[PDB]
Amino acid sequence: TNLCPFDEVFNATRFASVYAWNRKRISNCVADYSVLYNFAPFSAFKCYGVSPTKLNDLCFTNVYADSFVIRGNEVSQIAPGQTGNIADYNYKLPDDFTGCVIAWNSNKLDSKVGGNYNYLYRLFRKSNLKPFERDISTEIYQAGNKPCNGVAGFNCYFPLRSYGFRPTYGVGHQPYRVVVLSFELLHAPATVCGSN
Amino acid sequence: DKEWILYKIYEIMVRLDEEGHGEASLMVSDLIYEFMKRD
């Protein structure tokens, strides 16, 4: 088998918006998890159910890599049992999550003079997401009793907002790229193995 | 009422962004989330 294409995920030119977060299935390959740990000075790196240093030793049926951009202050919501605008309405981890959450500051890549409006998040939603649910709808949110009929206005709000990242922002408002690794062990062959 | 002030906070979020105050706009966005989460 070949090497696992974690470089395609971590070093991708553009990341997804968090509300439309990307998922990549990793399978039938050998993963040198050392190139992961030294890809960047990570501002977040926490594993659940696995030891981070022993990833090169383990084998799994599948690895799923989820990736997106959020604000620095929102990175802490990418963890089991968290609530907030991102955990509730954009990306939600389960309580029994088995994997790692990795994040790094991407101000030099995703910020822009005048504002980068390519990255969006969901501000309005009637209920919280289930774990690993993805909602990409753009229906007008009805805050009042009157149906909105697809028209934005009073009590009728477009549900997404853009981050508008600018390099002059405080660090808590700067963009961070996040990669969530899910390590799946089914009753099946383990075709994703570390280099050791 | 609650619906009027929500509209005004939404309106100020948008206005802040249009007038170049994007970081302030993001802070108002956070207020909108917390406000609508209240009973």
Numbering used by the authors:
A (entry chain B): 333 to 528
B (entry chain A): 1 to 39
Structure paper excerpt:
The spike protein of the SARS-CoV-2 binds to human angiotensin-converting enzyme 2 (ACE2) through the receptor-binding domain (RBD) and changes the conformation to fuse the viral and cell membranes, mediating viral entry. Here, we used a structure-guided strategy to engineer an inhibitor peptide with mutation-tolerant and potent binding ability against all SARS-CoV-2 variants. We named the peptide CeSPIACE (COVID-19 eliminative Short-Peptide Inhibiting ACE2 binding). For engineering, we determined approximately 2 Å-resolution crystal structures of CeSPIACE or its intermediate-stage peptides complexed with the RBDs of several strains, including WT, Alpha, Delta, BA.2, BA.5, or XBB.1.5.
We identified a 39-mer peptide region that was easily chemically synthesized and modified it to improve structural stability and mutation tolerance. The high-resolution structures identified the roles of the peptide residues and provided information on which residues to modify and how to modify them. One of our intermediate peptides, Ce149, potently inhibited mutant RBDs up to the BA.2 strain by enhancing a hydrophobic interaction with F486, but its efficacy was attenuated by the F486V mutation of the BA.5 strain due to the high specificity for the F486 side chain, making it vulnerable to mutation. To solve the conflict between specificity and universality in antiviral treatments, we engineered CeSPIACE to recognize the invariant architecture of the RBD critical for its function, thereby achieving mutation-tolerant affinity.
